[PDB]
Each structure stands twice: as C-alpha cells, then as structure tokens.
Amino acid sequence: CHWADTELNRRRRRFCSKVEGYGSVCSCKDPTPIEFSPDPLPDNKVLNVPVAVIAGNRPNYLYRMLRSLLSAQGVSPQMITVFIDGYYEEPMDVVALFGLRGIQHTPISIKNARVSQHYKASLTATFNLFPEAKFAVVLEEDLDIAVDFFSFLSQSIHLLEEDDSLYCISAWNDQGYEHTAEDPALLYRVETMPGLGWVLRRSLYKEELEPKWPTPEKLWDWDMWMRMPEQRRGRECIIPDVSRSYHFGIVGLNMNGYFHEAYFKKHKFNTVPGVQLRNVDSLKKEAYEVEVHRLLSEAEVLDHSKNPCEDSFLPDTEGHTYVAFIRMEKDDDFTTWTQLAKCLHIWDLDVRGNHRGLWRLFRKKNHFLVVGVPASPYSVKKPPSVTPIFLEPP
Ligand SMILES: O=c1ccn([C@@H]2O[C@H](COP(=O)(O)OP(=O)(O)O)[C@@H](O)[C@H]2O)c(=O)[nH]1
Ligand SMILES: [Mn+2]
Questions:
Q1: Cα(268) to centroid of ligand 2, in Å?
Q2: Could you list which ranges are Lumenal topological domains?
C-alpha cells in the first residue's frame, strides 16, 4: 500500500508484510487505528504502577486484549510490559505493532508447572524493571479490560497500603453473573485470591512468595497454590460486585468450549465509564464488620419454609435487602452452599464468595445475604422462628 508516510504507518507496513489474518489493519484504504485516545484520569493514584501482561503463543487473543487495555481511561502505555512464554514470532510482532515493550522467556518444564515458572519469572522481572514500584497489576492475555479498569484501581489502591489484612485487589467477582450482579459502585471482601486482573504487593512477593515458589517438577497451578492457607493466611482480597474484566479465551490449558459456555459466558462485565466507588474506606477490616452488621439489621428475614431454588423464594420486589440462613456446622461445611449455587446457576465447583460464612449477591435486583449457621459469627442474628435451610446432593 501507499499509506501516508508516518511513523504509525511504517509500523503498519512491517507488520502487514509479515503476518495475515487481522483484517482491516492491512487494508489499503480503511486502515484501522493502531493508536488510541483514551480519556485522562484526573489525580491518578495508579499512574506509577507497572502492568505485567502474561502471554504465550496465542497471538490473536493478545491483539484482542491489548486493544481494550489501550482503550481504558488513565492507562500509561510506558508502564506496560508483555511477557511472552517463548520465542514465537507472531506474538512479538503484535507487541511491536502497538509499540510496547516485550520480554521473551525460554520455557521451563511442562503443562501447568510451566505456566507457574513463567509467572515467577515475569513477577521477578517486573519488580526489577521498576525498583521503586510497590505494586504491580497482573493481566492475562485472554481478558477484555473494562473501560474503567484503572479508575477502579485508582480509587481502591490505597486500601492495600493501609490494611495489612488484605491479600490483593481483583477485578473479578466469581459470583457476579448477569442475573446476580447489579451495582458497579459496590465492593466486597472475600476469603480467596480471584486473579483474572489483580494487584500484587511487592513486599508480599519479594518477602513471602518468591522464596517458596514451587520448583519446576511440581504439577501445581500457581493460583491454586496462592489460595492455600500457607500462602493466603487468612487474608482477604477486594472485589467489585460488577467485574472489570472478562475471560474470552476458549483455547487454553484447562479451557474448552463447554466449560466456557457453562461458567464464563454469562459473567457480567461493567461498561459504565468512570464509576465513583461508594464509601471505599468501609472495606477496611474493622469498618467492614460495621457495614455487615448494618446490612443485617436492615435485611428482611425470608420465609424458610419455601423452596430456595425458585424465584418465589423472594417477594416480587426491586431494591430491598433480604437474608437467608443455611446449615453450616463447621468452618468447612459448604454442602448446602454448593447445592444452592448449583440451582442458582452461578459458580459451584469450589467454594468462593464467602466472608466469615457470609455470601453477598443479587436476586431479581434485591440484595441477597446468605449466612452459615452455626459456623458464621453472624449466626447470632437468626431469629428463633428460622430453621436453617439444608440441601444435600443426590
Ligand atoms: O504454555 C503456556 C500456557 C499458558 N501461559 C499463560 O498462562 C495463562 C493461563 O492461560 P490459559 O488461559 O491457557 O489457562 P486456563 O485459564 O485456560 O486454564 C495465560 O495468560 C497464558 O499466557 C503461558 O505463559 N505458557
Ligand atoms: Mn485463560
């Protein structure tokens, strides 16, 4: 082609001369913009946090994910680094087309152990690239990034700095499905590490995780290892009710077409720009227990003689707060919750969403609290008239 001789189009020639399958990027007329104009973020508290993009040999996914990353408000392209698990040519070509920094890594070990070793190399490299950074954003190559991803991190990053009980901040709510998530200004505390767009504290990585990172022979998933008690240690992460990332990768290490249609396709994705988070400082450890007690003292107790698995369980309402109590006789008795999550059509393969035996979600746009009795500390608010709901698997 004869595109106008500028730096952006010279970058375009070298790419379009080498690879195929990207459509309007390579057309003569109608060239797709390969530079973006996201909106500015006034007073950006995240402006000096590096962003680590983890990638393998999935060049089409990476190009899709980078287009939404470069479109988010308040993004800093200079802070982005793409870490590729190997020396594949096409992924490096895609990084070059957008003009970002790329780092290649020779693969170590096999299967999930090799994903684990790549993560460890990338996290250690990020904190070597910026010796003064205190956090780092970790992003997978198969995620769409919400347009307010950095606005969300900018307003909440100060919680990691002030609350030592916090493990991380994540963009992903495991129980935020299209029919059970509603409020993009709302945040929770959860007893797990969700990943899928998360913030890592440098002191946590350099002083705790890196010295005991699993060696290459162990066929362990890095994220399941980080959820083990010996790593998390009772700490919690901050998540929003409406997720700020979306997992679109169908071809992956543990991913197939069926598992995606069943547990990811219906995940809710925030599209409202520049949301102001509501009362952020209440997510600190002791202030949050004040908030949960306030929520439980305004919630209407539901009729527990009715079927929990059907819509009739709640009055025909919008905007109310209802509470339900389920049987949980030890800190690990999740039998009823798992059956409840299955019939609610949310995540039910391993337990997530819990905070001291409490689950928070939405049902027909009412806030819906679930309390485990007798194990939860909040069991003290169950009236005598309620017999906790119990359901066992067939
Ligand atoms: O051989 C590999 C396979 C995976 N990945 C990275 O590990 C993450 C997990 O990817 P994948 O979606 O394939 O795992 P899944 O979620 O499907 O189980 C991705 O960001 C990949 O870039 C990698 O670096 N090398
Ligand atoms: Mn994936």
A1: 17
A2: 1-394
Are 150 and 139 in contact, with CB atoms under 8 Å apart? no
In 3D, which of 255, 293, 263 has the Cα closest to residue 175? 263
| Burial (Cβ within 10 Å: 0-12, 13-18, ≥19) of residue 46 | buried
Q: How was this structure determined?
A: X-ray
Cross-strand partners of 59 = none
| 148 vs 369: CA distance, rounded Å | 27
SS3 call for 333: coil
Length of the chain: 394
Whether 307 and 365 have beta carbons less than 8 Å apart is answered as no
Q: What DSSP string describes 188-226?
A: EEESS---SSEEEEHHHIIIIIGGGPPPTT----HHHHH
Residue with tokens 């001291």: 356
- Enter the tokens of residue 48: 């000096």
Known binding residue 208? Answer is: no
| 338 φ, ψ (degrees, to nearest 5) | -60, -45
Query: Which of these, 194, 207, 297, lies nearest to 240 by C-alpha position?
Result: 194
What one-letter code names the amino acid at 317?
T
Strands 358-363 and 366-374 come out as antiparallel
Question: 326, 388 in Cβ contact below 8 A?
Answer: yes
Does ligand 1 lie within 6 Å of residue 142's CB atom?
yes
Q: Which three-class secondary structure state does DSSP give residue 65? A: helix
Resolution to 1 decimal place, in Å:
2.6
Strand partners, 21: none
Q: Is the CB of 247 under 6 A from ligand 1?
A: no
The identity of residue 53, as a single letter, is V
CATH 3.90.550.10 fits 51-283, yes or no: yes
Tell me, using a 6 A CB cutoff, whether residue 253 lines ligand 1: yes
Mention every residue, 6+ apart, whose C-beta is less than 8 A from residue 69.
Answer: 51, 53, 75, 80, 139, 145
Helix (H, G, I), strand (E, B) or coil at 144: strand
Separation of CA 357 from chain center: 21
Q: CA 322 to CA 187: how far, in whole Å?
A: 18
Q: How many A from CA of 365 to the centre of ligand 1?
A: 35
